[PDB]
């Protein structure tokens, strides 16, 4: 009954064997292919990657972060995570010629497009209550009232807003879907760095999904991952070549600890990842 | 090579023996599958499907209508095509409470949002010029200038404009990607009718692409189709089982005939399909 992580390993056989060179915004070249999709069963495995450690705590805590609507890279390092921190620094702000907006303020990103979609952005502390659409709710509410709705979609794409985020998202969009009280997710990431980011995202949306099956008391179905610019950077050919050699381990199970029923209620303890045995370390 | 309609023949072959039964907004059934993707070559073929005739005027008049950022549907009939008709013909408006409206008026549907993102939609009569975000053209901008960008996205799925709308868009978003000179495009499709949606919406986008590659001096690369709710109507099953018995042949070919400076300058008279064989029947 084939292991879902083969889907990813296989995508990387692909991009190695067929990718073409393509530079990013900063000139570094990569090997890129355009158009891809793997499917992960959540039938309660949790597709946290085995042939290498992904940073759980990170995923986790980053989500509670968007979940809470937040836009301060600062609000987030308070919780010991510096993956966004980097785009909140005076310097980086300034680059983009936001020389006003004070340290940490990421502009309008996931978390504000996630709950104030179309609300005018003042700053990362201007209280935004009731303002803009709260697509996180409506996804939920629709799930609970008609689950055959064939448009339960959350978008982080705002052109009106893009000329204006620390960056544009590469989760443009995710849709959900429901049948036999099983819930599935599908995600459209415009740009995918499989070496070092892809596996995080899957976590990240496998998480989201669980959270939602929970609050709506559905069962978890497939996560489907969809990419446009799937690329590996060149430094990584190496190490991935090694890693593409590892044999996947069982995916862990993810438990939830505490029947909890607003989405926004969840808290870092509420889950606990169980039996994650990632192979070690690569270079 | 190995032919491309096989893709789609696959996708279906799949659903109909693997999809679960799932009902739509007017409780009709659907064997249904969630999530696929198929890649269609645009390299000196254009991939109009064969095993099933597609309404091509239909497709070739629909985009141009989009291109021009039109939202009154009777404009599209106008030009010979009835797809989007009883959708702005009277009854289908207050079934959604649309009343202080005028008729053929679909609201801030696709055409509207390609050329005017985050712009207050009023009615269909209204010069729209200057306000919003010409997501569309910007896309042509961002290619010409600089093709590496990984962000060309023409997103229609506006949640604010979502009460206001006749139909919600099936096509929430696409990305182009150009490498080594060829252009590609991926459409993410909320939901898609394997019966009688898809053959069409592929076309539409393909042809979309030939239009940008042409305008931008680039050559068409790949159209990758992405679906969300892919489904067959229980209705279409027995017939499909039949085109399921049909072997499809080479694609046609599609030669733009004049030479076009901006996108809005297109004219239908501008497209010959070529060595085009369509079945059935």
Swiss-Prot record, chain A:
It is an enzyme of class 2 (transferase). InterPro entries: Thymidate_synth/dCMP_Mease, Thymidate_synth/dCMP_Mease_dom, Thymidate_synth/dCMP_Mease_sf, Thymidylate_synthase, Thymidylate_synthase_AS. GO terms for molecular function: folic acid binding; mRNA regulatory element binding translation repressor activity; sequence-specific mRNA binding; thymidylate synthase activity. GO terms for cellular component: cytoplasm; cytosol; mitochondrial inner membrane; mitochondrial matrix; mitochondrion; nucleus. DUMP binds at residues 25, 150-151, 170-171, 190-193, 201, 231-233. Catalyzes the reductive methylation of 2'-deoxyuridine 5'-monophosphate (dUMP) to thymidine 5'-monophosphate (dTMP), using the cosubstrate, 5,10- methylenetetrahydrofolate (CH2H4folate) as a 1-carbon donor and reductant and contributes to the de novo mitochondrial thymidylate biosynthesis pathway. HAMAP family: Thymidy_synth_bact. Belongs to the thymidylate synthase family. This is Thymidylate synthase.
